[PDB]
Amino acid sequence: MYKLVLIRHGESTWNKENRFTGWVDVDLTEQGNREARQAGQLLKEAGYTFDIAYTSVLKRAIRTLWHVQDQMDLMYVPVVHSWRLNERHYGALSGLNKAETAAKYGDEQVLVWRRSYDTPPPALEPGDERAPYADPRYAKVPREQLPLTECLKDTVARVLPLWNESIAPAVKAGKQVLIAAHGNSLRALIKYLDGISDADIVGLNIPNGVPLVYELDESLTPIRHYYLG
Amino acid sequence: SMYKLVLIRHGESTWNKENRFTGWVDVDLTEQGNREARQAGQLLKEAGYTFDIAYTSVLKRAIRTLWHVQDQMDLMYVPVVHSWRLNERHYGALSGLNKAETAAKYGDEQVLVWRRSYDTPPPALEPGDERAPYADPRYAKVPREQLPLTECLKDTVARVLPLWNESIAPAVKAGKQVLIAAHGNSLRALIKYLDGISDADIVGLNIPNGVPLVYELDESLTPIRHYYLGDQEAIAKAQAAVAQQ
Ligand code: NA
């Protein structure tokens, strides 16, 4: 029996505005700060501790992790910041709210995108300000691996290598691991962990700033999972 | 080639403000300390500095100072190495005691020996003291016999330098832009080694809280010069204040 803890970042400014964010590096709102501190308090009171954390390169997830670390008195543990835990890339939808998206692309195409595991939204132009190529976060990432858009299938494909490379060996080694990330990168892990179908994973809701605990057997197969609080 | 190395002592801590020996006790920043650290980050950002990696201690006053700097510079994603080897000098049984009350009790000379004798440590913690480091998860990978119950600066130098030799110096040599966010005595220890300062002279080195301290090093990592970032007159005032304590 191992335990692995997952948590989605607290409310971001763009969550509050119901805007597609993706790789845009927006910060937490004060509510998102509170959710993160509350999650830290919950893990602490329920007797959790961690040896290492994995997070993305996006500050909304990183700041969530900082609050959890702060509240648990774990500010000293090693942290890995991986672009592979970034939120799904939403291409040209990044920055649009629901009304704006419906207006530009029409309801039917939005419905197809919302439902389709393997159809990506319109891509960023490679020269768009929002493209990742000039960003110092991705300086060592092979250029061809950087997305200008992603369907959820793409997101899953680039999240999952972190499982065999890093998370599973750490868990098997007896490390107490925390993963502080984003709705869709957490979906990718959960998709693999619980063997969820392409069709069902699309609808899985994960709330901001609530610790999600997986209990795993010797083979890293889930026994059960639950949210704290 | 010239390399730039940035050092910073933690922002004002609660026990700096209360005038208490701290050592390895894991106290936090005051609001002033938070402001110093944010200002430090703003200054570094405005002066066009960036970092590939930061080294810090396992103590939250230094780590939170680093976090403010990372926050202000938009560098929250960069690699950070947290090492007990950058901890403040271990203050032994003095840890938690008021400096004035201690001087009243044991005399000024005796406290000054404990504070600044290069090679004579403060009285040791008893190993069964709750303040001893043995059950602390921060030190669980440190062999028991290497964990101090007290340190003089000389001891602090011996435990700081292997991190410089094995990790930090190679990273500077490789052209990485390094920030070290640490503590008064662990920074004095490293600087003692970098500037080749004598045992008697290192005594007077006074590093202000929360001020970026830039070293320019040549190809062999020998300092060309160092200087502090920010309001130079305010920094001189802060230096006078540290020296008086
Ligand atoms: Na300690």
Numbering used by the authors:
A (entry chain B): 1 to 229
B (entry chain A): 0 to 244
Please, what does the article write about this entry?
The enzyme 2,3-bisphosphoglycerate-dependent phosphoglycerate mutase (PGAM) catalyzes the interconversion of 3-phosphoglycerate and 2-phosphoglycerate, a key step in the glycolytic pathway. PGAM converts 3-phosphoglycerate to 2-phosphoglycerate through a ping-pong mechanism in which a phosphoenzyme transfers a phosphate group from an active-site histidine to 3-phosphoglycerate to form a 2,3-bisphosphoglycerate intermediate that subsequently transfers the phosphate from the 3-position to yield the 2-phospho­glycerate product and a reconstituted phosphoenzyme. As a key enzyme in glycolysis and energy metabolism, PGAM is a potential target for novel antibiotics.
The dicarboxylic acid adopts a bound conformation that places one carboxylate group in the carboxylate-binding pocket formed by Thr21 and Gly22, while the other carboxylate group is oriented towards His9 near the positively charged region responsible for binding the transferred phosphate. This structure was obtained from a different crystal form that was grown from 2.4 M sodium malonate. The alternate crystal packing in the malonate-grown crystals coincided with a significant shift of the α-­helix containing residues Arg114 and Arg115 relative to its position in the P1 crystal form. Arg114 and Arg115 are largely responsible for binding the 3-phosphate of the substrate molecule and it is unknown whether the malonate-grown crystal form could accommodate 3-­phosphoglycerate binding. The inclusion of two metabolite-like fragment structures in the ensemble (2-phosphoserine and malonate) provides starting points for elucidating ligand-binding flexibility and potential for small-molecule inhibitor design.
